[PDB]
Design a protein around this ligand. Structure first.
Ligand SMILES: *C(=O)[C@@H]([C@@H]1NC(C(=O)O)=C(S[C@H]2CN[C@@H](C(=O)N(C)C)C2)[C@@H]1C)[C@@H](C)O
Length: 230
């Protein structure tokens, strides 16, 4: 885990007047970029990035399936990108506290502590995770190396497609914990390059209420281009 060639990307974060880190994981190597590199090994609430693990747990334990319509009426996959209806809260209650805690410990996600409220522990605590831990988790998902069904991992990966450009596929999940102080913003995912190679990323930055949600994607894309990952 090493600071990368950071001269330019550091300035990208500086221009937004906030602190952020970008963690990049290729085969074996992790590199750190941004203007607040200590964030990479700092624990934060995962916020909506936990939807990835919620979905894996719910699908693996047959508490839902990819075709179920949650009463706008929505599937699990549509709810991955949009939060108009509380699908993942409902799924967490179906899973229940016992099974959720067992699965979170089996995966070893972050500090693996979910407390006693099964439907909000990922937003206000006590569950916390570092950006390095998030990039390792999503790298395992991208490579079908998590200890879940191969089909479940493929189904969750398919829910996470963000953009496709000139043969590159960008997968990922945003999160924003706006009700804690300081606010935390996430964009965690991976690039599938045209030849099949995977480069995983975790962007983590301090948010403020006036920022557009798209600031995370903007910083990510500019940085990935500067690093020649896309
Ligand atoms: C997950 O972190 C939350 C979910 N994700 C998300 C995002 O990453 O952009 C938004 S939070 C952010 C968007 N606008 C602000 C807002 O208050 N709402 C439109 C609700 C905050 C979205 C709510 C959530 C499921 O925890």
């Amino acid at each position: 885990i090493v600071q990368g060639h950071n001269q330019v990307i550091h300035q990208y974060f500086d221009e937004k007047n906030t602190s952020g880190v970008l963690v990049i994981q290729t085969d074996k190597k992790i590199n750190l970029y941004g203007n607040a590199l200590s964030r990479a090994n700092t624990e934060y609430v995962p916020a909506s990035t936990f939807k990835m693990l919620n979905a894996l747990i719910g699908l693996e334990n047959q508490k839902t399936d990819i075709n179920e319509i949650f009463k706008k009426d929505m599937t699990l996959g549509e709810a991955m990108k949009l939060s108009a209806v509380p699908v993942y809260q409902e799924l967490a209650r179906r899973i229940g506290l016992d099974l959720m805690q067992k699965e979170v410990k089996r995966i070893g996600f972050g500090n693996a502590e979910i407390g006693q409220q099964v439907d909000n522990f990922w937003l206000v605590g006590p569950l916390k995770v570092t950006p390095i831990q998030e990039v390792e988790f999503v790298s395992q998902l991208a490579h079908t190396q998590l200890p879940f069904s191969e089909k479940v991992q493929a189904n969750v990966k398919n829910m996470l497609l963000l953009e496709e450009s000139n043969g590159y596929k960008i997968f990922g999940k945003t999160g924003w914990a706006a009700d804690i102080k300081p606010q935390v913003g996430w964009l965690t995912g991976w690039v599938e390059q045209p030849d099949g190679k995977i480069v995983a990323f975790a962007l983590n930055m301090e948010m403020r209420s006036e920022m557009p949600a798209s600031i995370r994607n903007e910083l990510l894309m500019k940085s990935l281009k500067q690093l020649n990952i896309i």
